[PDB]
């Protein structure tokens, strides 16, 4: 179809890191959306559904309070400003492993050439082990 679209994914081999990946089955880069420096490039002005999900996993809890945070940023072409659009926080800890997912979703108007960044603070805590657990995506509407 004709709308700018992306659904991209964490990279299974990417070593302990969040690397957004469209070369995959059931993954999308289309209609001018580019993946540049691990960010989504908005090809045109409009309204975009933006969404991301990360799934964190620990084995047990180390002795610090852990704050897992997951964030989608808009880098505006002209101003060159990084700004929070979507952010959520989780606090997993207070033998056996734990799993905290985070979902982010929303509708904003984006200028052509704007960039979207899906990022988290602790890549050591990231589980992409099976598929569909870590993904970044937008489609214009």
């Amino acid at each position, epitope marked *: 179809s004709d709308k700018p679209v992306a659904h991209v994914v964490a990279n299974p081999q990417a070593e302990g890191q969040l690397q957004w990946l469209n070369r995959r089955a059931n993954a999308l880069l289309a209609n001018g959306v580019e993946l*540049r420096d691990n960010q989504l490039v908005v090809p045109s002005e409009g309204l975009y559904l933006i969404y991301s999900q990360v799934l964190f996993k620990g084995q047990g809890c180390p002795s610090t309070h852990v704050l897992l945070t997951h*964030t989608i940023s808009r880098i505006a072409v002209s101003y*060159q400003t*990084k700004v929070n659009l979507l952010s959520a926080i989780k606090s997993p800890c207070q033998a056996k492993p734990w799993y905290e997912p985070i979902y982010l979703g929303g509708v904003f108007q984006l200028e052509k050439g704007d960039r979207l960044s899906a990022e988290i*603070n602790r890549p050591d805590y990231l589980d992409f082990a099976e598929s569909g657990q870590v993904y970044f995506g937008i489609i214009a509407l």
Partner: antibody
Amino acid sequence: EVQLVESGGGLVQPGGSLRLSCAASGYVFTDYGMNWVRQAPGKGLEWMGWINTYIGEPIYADSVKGRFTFSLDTSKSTAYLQMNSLRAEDTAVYYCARGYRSYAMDYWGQGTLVTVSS
Amino acid sequence: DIQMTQSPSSLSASVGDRVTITCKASQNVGTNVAWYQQKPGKAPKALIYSASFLYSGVPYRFSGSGSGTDFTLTISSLQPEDFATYYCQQYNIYPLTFGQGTKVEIKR
């Protein structure tokens, strides 16, 4: 591989004028702003200013305001630091470092040492 | 102009030791704070941004923390190559400002 390579520095004489070039490679140069940071010989880090590479507008620290000026050649992916009326006190390693507006600095130029000396 | 004051101004520790350096900001900068590592006569290497976020390819033993005014950088297990000076920086408002640096020397 993102690379900021700097040059232009070295000996100058007081009251003098120098231009520094930060030549960027490995990224889209206008996708990020550029920061200028100078560090005295063995002291800490001082932030001189930031320039938007897309629209070309800089921002200066109050001390450096106007006595230094930033500019660009976009088409060759290089950012400039023009330095004038240099005093011995100005001796420093000058750094270019990539970053958005009012944000952190991910990549730093290797730095180049300016010596203001008679 | 926002002050950033790191403590200690330098420390010794053995390899394997947990190491904390703390940064306190003269005003509330929120989470807009970053940590840098400068090995001697090298450029600074960006470690952490927005106070807890890790930069890619930076070892896990590094964890940044805090919000408000007080912030702490933490090396989980100190390594021989972590020998460096570390600078907190606040980007909340202009001008950007750096801590004074904290020397980390290894005991052996």
